[PDB]
Design a protein around this ligand. Sequence first.
Ligand SMILES: *[C@@H]1O[C@H](CO[C@@H]2O[C@@H](C)[C@@H](O)[C@@H](O)[C@@H]2O)[C@@H](O[C@@H]2O[C@H](CO)[C@@H](O)[C@H](O)[C@H]2NC(C)=O)[C@H](O)[C@H]1NC(C)=O
Ligand SMILES: *[C@@H]1O[C@H](CO)[C@@H](O[C@@H]2O[C@H](CO)[C@@H](O)[C@H](O)[C@H]2NC(C)=O)[C@H](O)[C@H]1NC(C)=O
Ligand SMILES: *[C@@H]1O[C@H](CO)[C@@H](O[C@@H]2O[C@H](CO)[C@@H](O)[C@H](O)[C@H]2NC(C)=O)[C@H](O)[C@H]1NC(C)=O
Ligand SMILES: *[C@@H]1O[C@H](CO)[C@@H](O)[C@H](O)[C@H]1NC(C)=O
Ligand SMILES: *[C@@H]1O[C@H](CO)[C@@H](O)[C@H](O)[C@H]1NC(C)=O
Ligand SMILES: *[C@@H]1O[C@H](CO)[C@@H](O)[C@H](O)[C@H]1NC(C)=O
Ligand SMILES: *[C@@H]1O[C@H](CO)[C@@H](O)[C@H](O)[C@H]1NC(C)=O
Ligand SMILES: *[C@@H]1O[C@H](CO)[C@@H](O)[C@H](O)[C@H]1NC(C)=O
Ligand SMILES: OC[C@H]1NC[C@H](O)[C@@H](O)[C@H]1O
Ligand SMILES: OC[C@H]1NC[C@H](O)[C@@H](O)[C@H]1O
Lengths: 496, 618
Amino acid sequence: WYGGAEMRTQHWPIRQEPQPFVTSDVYSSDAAFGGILERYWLSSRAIKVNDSVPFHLGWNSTERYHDTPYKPPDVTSIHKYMVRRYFNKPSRVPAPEAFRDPIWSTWALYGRAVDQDKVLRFAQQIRLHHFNSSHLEIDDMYTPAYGDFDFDEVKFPNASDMFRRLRDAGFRVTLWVHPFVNYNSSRFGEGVERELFVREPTGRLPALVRWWNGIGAVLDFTHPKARDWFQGHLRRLRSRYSVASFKFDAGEVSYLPRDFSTYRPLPDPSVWSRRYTEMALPFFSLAEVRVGYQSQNISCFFRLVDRDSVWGYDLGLRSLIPAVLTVSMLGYPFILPDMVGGNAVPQRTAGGDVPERELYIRWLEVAAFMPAMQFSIPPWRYDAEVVAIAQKFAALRASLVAPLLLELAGEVTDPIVRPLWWIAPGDETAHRIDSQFLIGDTLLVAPVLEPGKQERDVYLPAGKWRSYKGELFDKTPVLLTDYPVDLDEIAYFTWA
Amino acid sequence: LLDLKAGGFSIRNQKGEQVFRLAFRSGALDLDSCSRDGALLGCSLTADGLPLHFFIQTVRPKDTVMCYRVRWEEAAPGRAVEHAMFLGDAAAHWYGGAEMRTQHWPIRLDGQQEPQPFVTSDVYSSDAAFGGILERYWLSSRAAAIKVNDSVPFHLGWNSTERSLRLQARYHDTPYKPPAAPELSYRVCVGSDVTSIHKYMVRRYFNKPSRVPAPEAFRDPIWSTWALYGRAVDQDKVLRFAQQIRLHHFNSSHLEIDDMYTPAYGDFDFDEVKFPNASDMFRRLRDAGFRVTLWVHPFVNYNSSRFGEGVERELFVREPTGRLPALVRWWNGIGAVLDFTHPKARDWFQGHLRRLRSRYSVASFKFDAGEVSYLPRDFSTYRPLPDPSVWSRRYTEMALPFFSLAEVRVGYQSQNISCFFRLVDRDSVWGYDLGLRSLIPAVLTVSMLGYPFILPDMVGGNAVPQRTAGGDVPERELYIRWLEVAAFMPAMQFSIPPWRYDAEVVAIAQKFAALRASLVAPLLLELAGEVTDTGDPIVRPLWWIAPGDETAHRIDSQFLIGDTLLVAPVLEPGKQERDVYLPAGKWRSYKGELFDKTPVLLTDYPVDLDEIAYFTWA
Ligand SMILES: *[C@@H]1O[C@H](CO[C@@H]2O[C@@H](C)[C@@H](O)[C@@H](O)[C@@H]2O)[C@@H](O[C@@H]2O[C@H](CO)[C@@H](O)[C@H](O)[C@H]2NC(C)=O)[C@H](O)[C@H]1NC(C)=O
Ligand SMILES: *[C@@H]1O[C@H](CO)[C@@H](O[C@@H]2O[C@H](CO)[C@@H](O)[C@H](O)[C@H]2NC(C)=O)[C@H](O)[C@H]1NC(C)=O
Ligand SMILES: *[C@@H]1O[C@H](CO)[C@@H](O[C@@H]2O[C@H](CO)[C@@H](O)[C@H](O)[C@H]2NC(C)=O)[C@H](O)[C@H]1NC(C)=O
Ligand SMILES: *[C@@H]1O[C@H](CO)[C@@H](O)[C@H](O)[C@H]1NC(C)=O
Ligand SMILES: *[C@@H]1O[C@H](CO)[C@@H](O)[C@H](O)[C@H]1NC(C)=O
Ligand SMILES: *[C@@H]1O[C@H](CO)[C@@H](O)[C@H](O)[C@H]1NC(C)=O
Ligand SMILES: *[C@@H]1O[C@H](CO)[C@@H](O)[C@H](O)[C@H]1NC(C)=O
Ligand SMILES: *[C@@H]1O[C@H](CO)[C@@H](O)[C@H](O)[C@H]1NC(C)=O
Ligand SMILES: OC[C@H]1NC[C@H](O)[C@@H](O)[C@H]1O
Ligand SMILES: OC[C@H]1NC[C@H](O)[C@@H](O)[C@H]1O
């Protein structure tokens, strides 16, 4: 079975007392449901839970309105029927360069301590190592307090000159934003007085929340005034600095209080997540969100919740294909699998400071074949061979992958990243495979996802496949055993 | 002496009068389930066949007092318990309960009220809610009294058609949490006379203050900036006020600087714009012989420099999950409220009070708010409060280190806190709706509940627009008549001063200050010292010395100071006389007239604008 929710430990196929099926931050929890989910499950043997339901999901591996935020008021053919019936499609395609050039993020590289000096040094190193850039994403924290939209003049003494130097060096820029106003923000009082925040149950006062950056209120995206207000500050940041778009962080209702009031009543709390994702709409072309609750027709990128610099299915390298396939199934084609190499969080890093070298390389390779590719910890943090491998995969993405992604993106208005069973719906091996995927119907990808491996088994389904080296495999289906894939290579095959 | 039927019970006294009558209103007993073992009558199910823990236990604590312990405890959640207590015929008068907005003596409750939580509320704007000072205690002129048990999730309503109080236990739609199944339980006691049974009940249930406030608080006028200047108080205005107090030759217990002297609500430091040299102001006030108290409150607004400090040190009342501060609205805006159950929040509050005394030799503090009507519906505290109003108690405890010149405006078992208790803001009107005619009822009500050191708010009221007979300030006759009755109360507080009017008003105030100093103050100090022993109030109703006298039971325009000084102020406009009731015994007027043909109603007894009628026991 396939579908349901993005999870912390993501298996494909899918593989707990029923808890609310609501948008949560699953970074620290293997119980909760991730920021992107639909009440939709698909079987390899060829269900849509009704939107009305105060829906709670549990599970029992042995056989395979109270205490809740809910208030009362062949396999390919059937999947395509269900997708067409229930999921709206994006009507627009993001910027073409987002499907070709690497995105560069300050977050994993610098953390909160990002600076004017560090942004410009990052951009210079991107140019010196001869990489294109879709855009540069300035993350947490570039403001004096969480809720202020203006740049902190201590860390950014001449924002204008930074943006001018970045523009002159051919860099598009996106800015990190979020739905919170902390109590020590210069905008908190403004928000209390204009009644822009999510309220306690009686609906008279703001309700305080805790998120990873502290304590404040959360904007009510059901309130026209709160939306106009949020949008106004985004438009001011574009006007002042020619910023292209925004990374929309949080959006999960796990950051809203248990019981809460909104301008419009939300019998389904997760519709708050939807209303937040709608803030991406005016800047969709280079926007990203990390939640999706009927957010499919928002034509921006959808980011997997923070990946850890580990190998395993627990937000690591082996989670990428399951997570991307899961999200693709739910009608979100424009997927960004977070950061190449992961976020390098201490105690959650195979390595110490940064991901071990082999992990960075293997990740880079699989990320080069995904709809959008984002570096933070850059190739030149390692050595010249890693830079060269990244240059090779940038070139290969530009010439082979990007043109195919752009065609499939235009077509969507089906997913872009497809499971093997998409073209082989009757094939039980294709049903189980988690280490391979398709881009459209014609490009099959088999990355190495383990350390100390210069080969792997590659399953080819029925029909004819041409390897990158030009080998024609037409005695299919077949398992190619110990197929050579050196550290600096990926196995891919084209339809023929 | 108790008749138990399926639908309620009645109690008689030894003379065979019905002194208590109560209807069961959430069910009936199945009497066949009842049995008597000696003094205990227990019943095990209702007339619908639902299981019940019901008993009446008779207790004879003294030769002259019969009590009845009553429990009605339902089997499970879902089932609110209601008993309707009938007040009875027109000869039965009742006293106690709560300070209310419209305060009558004896108790009169108009219209219909579904039982609402018996919790400390701000009744300035509401004739429904229960005021800042209340006890679950009602007293009858027929010498019966009821104390509702402290355990009860107690809700009080009333029904004027049958003249009943609606006593209710419930756990749905209420700030009451069960201690970590509804139960209505109470004791009814019967005595020989209303004074005897009241003194039995007071001695059993109410703690006494162990200390007396500063002697001068019982003699000299208190001067408040609030009604005179409002929020816009400043350094110039405080010193000008103090100079005028001295020039018009008035003593001062202390000067009370009210709202607002800080840059934000939650900051303890003085605002340097309005008070450019606080130190020099306090030095000039000290040199001119002025003790000073400062207005404080339990709130920290979101734009206070101390708000972040309070979030981080977790000093505030939390939302139900107990993780984050809960925001509240009060009349000065939006912030958090300090958790006075938290040792750290108390140390913190106290620290800032001690710093204000150390820095400025401030004497004490006026502790504003304290009502749980300013706490959120559902809320968490460091120690759990199954009874939310215990928060009010915990707040009043902040007065303890500075009791001598402290005032609070709430009391929830706060009796043994030996500070003054202020009536909630009086309006500059004549009527029972927080006006002149409310003073005697409100003071008598609070005195009955074990709070002897009463401050009846501000002479002339607070002069709020839309709520002032006069316009800008109270009409002249109202100010004078109020001044006169306030001169006979345990503490007297001016804000709008006599010289706002004319020289005749100043002279009247000087006369009443002199009369308070020489006649009233010496008697107040003796009775205040006596409370600590007797538990008896300072301001007493006429029936205190005349418990069998039905006229004394009904009088709301007269009161006693102790047993020996009877006071009859004029409480109406255009009157230079009033009827004065003297109970049995001998009474000597201020002019020396001996009345010994008593009881008597003295009709059209002369009391000019600048006079009060008083009589001494002879
Ligand atoms: C006005 O106050 C004076 C002075 O009060 C005395 O000193 C104060 C600092 C304080 O400690 C008071 O408690 C003192 O009594 C009053 O004059 C005194 O009156 C009392 C009795 O009330 C008498 O025993 C004292 O001997 C007097 N002391 C002096 C210095 O004269 C005066 O009574 C007050 N006037 C009014 C109208 O209250
Ligand atoms: C207030 O008390 C009155 C008097 O007991 C109630 O009115 C009576 O209600 C009963 C209900 O069964 C009627 O059968 C009586 O005949 C009524 N008599 C009169 C004169 O009204 C009234 O219901 C109570 N009000 C509330 C709000 O509970
Ligand atoms: C002052 O009055 C308070 C309020 O009644 C007393 O507090 C109670 O004391 C008992 C026994 O110490 C405790 O078990 C209760 O929990 C207290 N109640 C509350 C609400 O705090 C206090 O004991 C009195 N102190 C003195 C010295 O009389
Ligand atoms: C701002 O608020 C956060 C919590 O919301 C707190 O940790 C931090 O100390 C505050 N910063 C300042 C400048 O006060
Ligand atoms: C960089 O961008 C240019 C301009 O659009 C494009 O022709 C080229 O393919 C890109 N370079 C790489 C390495 O993909
Ligand atoms: C009153 O409450 C006490 C203490 O909770 C309880 O034990 C007692 O028995 C109650 N009295 C009645 C008459 O129910
Ligand atoms: C706090 O908010 C109130 C209400 O708007 C405002 O009048 C006051 O000046 C504010 N105080 C500070 C110091 O921010
Ligand atoms: C207040 O007055 C005294 C005496 O004039 C002076 O020495 C002190 O520094 C002044 N302080 C301020 C706050 O102006
Ligand atoms: O605090 C920054 C951090 N927050 C969580 C996001 O998922 C990350 O990409 C990054 O924006
Ligand atoms: O804001 C101050 C105001 N608040 C309510 C009090 O009861 C008044 O005396 C006065 O202190």
